[PDB]
Amino acid sequence: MQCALPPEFYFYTKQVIEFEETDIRNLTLWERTDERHTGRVSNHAELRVLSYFMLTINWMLSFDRDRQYPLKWILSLTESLTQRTTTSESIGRNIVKVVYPDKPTSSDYFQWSEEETLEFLKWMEKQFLPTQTSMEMTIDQKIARRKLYKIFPLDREDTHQLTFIEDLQERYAKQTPFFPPARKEAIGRLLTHIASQLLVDFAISKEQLKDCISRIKNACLHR
DNA sequence: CAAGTGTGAGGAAAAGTAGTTGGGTTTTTTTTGCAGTTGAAGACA
């Protein structure tokens, strides 16, 4: 649902997980890494789930010999996605993007699709107040402050936006139209995007991620 | 190709403390009325 809600890909990936994903068994939380060096053994189950997820899309997409997923279909799932409002979710992911980390969302900072800009300032005027309350200062430093806020007073000197499954539905429809080198490029095009998404919620490692990716890649070819 | 010990540092933050100044008391060790009187210069036998 996160994006290319391609209903079939749920058990596609569930199946590869079925496959070599811990001998077709639900990944359990890793162990009590007692050692202080905290080696990257990648046993963090999810990290591998996302890895299988990505892989699945690439493989399945790479070899859909029957041509079940049309050339022009893959990029459509990309055009529809590349941003949009969010019945709360995407607005959230913007708020997380704003930890201004490795500059994958930094520019989103810059762009910030109009309103996204607006509902952002809304969430700042509501949840940033959870900000603070100078002490003593003869009331002085404080009063002055109060006056200043008295000054710019402001805060106002479809209910419009939509929910999550609404947005999800409408892009599933926006791809409503289902029934060589370029598609390979498009596929890589799309995978980078999800890499952005899944990586962005998490500790990324613009390569550990792929280090992780690399790992199971290796794991897999022991058929 | 690959997994596994040993381990040095980089980093964060509130309050304190620095430097540079000033403030700041502190703290501090032009006669206008009167009447008399003395001493004086001057003078004398």
Curated annotation (Swiss-Prot):
Primary location: nucleus
Record keyword Transcription regulation present: yes
GO MF terms, alphabetically ordered: RNA polymerase I core promoter sequence-specific DNA binding; TBP-class protein binding; zinc ion binding
Record GO cellular component, one term: nucleolus
Subunit structure, as described in the record: Component of the core factor (CF) complex, which consists of RRN6, RRN7 and RRN11. The CF heterotrimer may further dimerize to form a hexamer. RRN7 interacts with RRN6, RRN11, SPT15 and RRN9.
Function of the molecule: Component of RNA polymerase I core factor complex (CF) that acts as a SUA7/TFIIB-like factor and plays a key role in multiple steps during transcription initiation such as pre-initiation complex (PIC) assembly and postpolymerase recruitment events in polymerase I (Pol I) transcription. Binds rDNA promoters and plays a role in Pol I recruitment. After binding of UAF (upstream activation factor) to an upstream element of the promoter, CF is recruited in a SPT15/TBP-dependent manner to form a pre-initiation complex.
Further information: Present with 398 molecules/cell in log phase SD medium.
Domain notes: Although it shares weak sequence similarity with SUA7/TFIIB, displays a similar subdomain organization as SUA7/TFIIB, with a N-terminal zinc finger, a connecting region (composed of B-reader and B-linker regions), followed by 2 cyclin folds.
Family: Belongs to the RRN7/TAF1B family.
Protein name: RNA polymerase I-specific transcription initiation factor RRN7
Originating species: Saccharomyces cerevisiae (strain ATCC 204508 / S288c) (Baker's yeast)
Gene transcribed to yield this protein: RRN7
Range within the parent protein: 258 to 512 of 514
